[model samples]
Target: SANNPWTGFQIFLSPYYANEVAAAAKQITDPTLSSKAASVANIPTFTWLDSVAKIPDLGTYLASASALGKSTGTKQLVQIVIYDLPDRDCAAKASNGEFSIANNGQANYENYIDQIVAQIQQFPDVRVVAVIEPDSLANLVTNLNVQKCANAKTTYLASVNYALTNLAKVGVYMYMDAGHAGWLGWPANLSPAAQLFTQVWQNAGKSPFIKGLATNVANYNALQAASPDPITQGNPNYDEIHYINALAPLLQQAGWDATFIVDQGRSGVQNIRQQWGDWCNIKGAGFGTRPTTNTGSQFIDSIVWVKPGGECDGTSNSSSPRYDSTCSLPDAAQPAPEAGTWFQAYFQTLVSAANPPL
Candidate 1:
């Protein structure tokens, strides 16, 4: 909101989640938790429209977006996480998505992107920023063996290109996923990941409308933390911000001015895990940074909650169709909702455990 940013930062919060928080606040028995709920109510969080199963009808989207525009009063920024890729999360079970390229995936995606662009076109007055296809590019470089699209990199690239060209044509700021510090931030994958992005960007016709890369969508990795694994300050290989800097040089050398956004939603949490599912539905995870454009770096675009905290990354105990071993691990949160469903307990945990306390 230009008139009121909560803290003078332009961002959007879904009335649905804000109302949910407000409802939780009234029901909470603990003082700290109740207080946290009210604070959580005010903080701007991402409203996800990810996956094939999760999108709303045009009426709802237009109504929701228009109301948000009217309420924020001027130049409201809406952050959306886009995770629908055929063979999404190819290498991992914690958060695999719907859609398969072999089975009409291209047409399915084209239809989806067209619909999204149409809905977004309704709001010339609103700024809708999409974190495009979270694992689409990263998987091509990092998860060849784990993802189902190991043999279909070209298909993935085409999908990204199609989405980018169409979305850019409309005025939605698009940020492609660069994974996180633990993934692309690793040394071996660094240059290859940047190259993958360059390839995809060029394939998208190298549209100047592409805003930047999103780091750590729906994952718990810090932008500038050292104590977790104990590294030097600004460790180029470990810190998300430093990782962005390293990738930035490669992107710039490729003739792209790359700005970066970090998902600080789970960055504040620091603990060992029994399995990779620990990254999914983390029990003690807290919110790190809130939505802001005040990041001191010229390269940093904004810190956003790309992953809406309460949404289940996946279900544990084989309850959901997603069959990740990490979820069935001894310590993974058990019997949670399905991926993208509301997890009230999980949301409360994030608020109470917050590093910066909502």
Candidate 2:
């Protein structure tokens, strides 16, 4: 099913993810950084756990959260991840088969999944996007041997299918991991990446275990291209559009007839090239494609900001690591410097393009 333009799935982070963000903000003692952190901390986004307690007032809670804004022009959106099954390794555990979670004594994972489902059922109007597992399937296939990969894929699919079955009862649209087109297009010797997509569908019993796949999470748009050619300085051909053109055809050939989503969270600045690296904190690339509902090509679904701005993605090589001056922040006090950096980069490009202010 296509995402509704008026009412597509809204995306927000879990309280656990939010807390980690707050901790990152806390590490920055700079006044500018502190102010930016506070701004981000105030956004009224929902958390899978925290929203449960506020289920009675979820409608109000979401309305209020959407009203909150950063110094940058962006507003917060709610997001959810549903791979709470035991032995599901979201953060990656050595013994848990990379992304698999070991079923520990605490069946808390299953219980949590039930709780989230129940809460969503109660508040069906809440805008939320359920990213089941980020790299569970892709990492498993890429990192494991054939036999082990098959086993891991089956386990992960079962866990995700279970969650999807439960969550669908609440009308939640779920998306699976496609590992970005770039990872899938290493070379013919690496086995056709298209096979991975078919395998995920087959393992899921050809059911909609996932609504679609997400690409380029926390990576640059240029990197998402299907070309194997190394991107070097002075190479004008290496760009985000080039990657999109190359990967689109591969996605079509892979039988992903459904709509796919691109992570535009950081694409505000298109071809980011700097002395540091391709993804350095260089600012001012405009947002790639606007979010849309139509999936014209069999390849792409819709572009989205899966990774919101203002959240930091580790540190940079610049001298002042405090707020990443190389990038922009809505205000000095927004939490998660990286998100703000992205927002600024995105917004600056928009304004420069004479697009309406976000």
Candidate 3:
């Protein structure tokens, strides 16, 4: 069991949150409040944050890994969303990352990888599952019309290749961003999507290779099946396993074995707004499945909590940095806050609505 990749793994918790939850736990009273405190203390959650802006390149990743490992008392089962490709998230606003090819995106990305790889090598113990550039790879295949995505093609591939080539070096289990089933599930997008990733592994891979493909990184879609039952109803392949199976052979033919790691953090659905769209912190969302590596499928390595439940997807009103129309729809819950900020109401709703309650 120790040899399994998950054995030494630690689900990381930030010092801020550890303290916050600890405070919530301390309010226990002989008169009546013990359960409230214990509930906060008992949640099995992992930390989720962004690595976007002027981050210093000290241990780039090693120090953070060590800190999390130290705190958790195990090698970190860390899932860091590397969301900084140039003109990233061009498809939308809210959480539009801070990298742009106009500012020498290619060269800067290469140098940044150098620092990341250097630091990653320093920590041979921590298992770094890097979900590289959430929308970077998929946008190359589609969604290029949003904004800066217009001319991001050439440089974007260059950046993905650079990161893949280097990160794979030190045995980092790389989950290159593949758009969720909503985008790549159709028969039309399947072949092209498969080839897009197949080609990336061809050029940049020599050592580590593309170990995993991360689907539904921050979106809410059922892990095995979507409602109205995409498969049982004989619909197009809109489920995670089906989607991954369709693309797996393509990656295999292109000379890389592609396993999967699906994000189940928000898959436990309460009420779905639309079959294809409606992704902005929708009201009925809930925590889907808990983390486990026991998916019966050979290709799936794990199901993880990639998106921490409480963070706002984007804001409905205009005062926020990203004012998305989706977040303003009728289904969007009240008092929507900025993207990634704490949403108390949303937080409670997610916990209350968990499929397999924590």
User: Would you list the clashing residue pairs of candidate 1?
Assistant: 86-99, 90-146, 90-147, 91-146, 91-147
- Compared with the true structure, the alpha-carbon lDDT of candidate 3 equals 0.67
Per-residue lDDT value at 326 in model 3:
78
What would the per-residue lDDT of candidate 3 be over residues 251-353, giving only the tens digit for each residue? Answer: 7776676788888888887346644566787787776787788876777887877776766787778776678777887777766878776666665556557
- After best superposition, candidate 1 residue 144: deviation in angstroms? 1.7
lDDT of 2 by residue, 98-132 (tens): 12244441234445557666666654445455666
Reference-based lDDT, each prediction: 0.71, 0.45, 0.67
Q: What is the RMSD, in Å, between candidate 1 and the native fold over all Cα?
A: 3.7
RMSD, one per candidate, in order: 3.7, 9.3, 4.0
- Give the best candidate by TM-score: 1
Ranking by TM-score: 1, 3, 2
Question: What TM-score do all the candidates reach, one by one?
Answer: 0.88, 0.55, 0.83
Candidates 1 and 2 compared: the better one by TM-score is 1
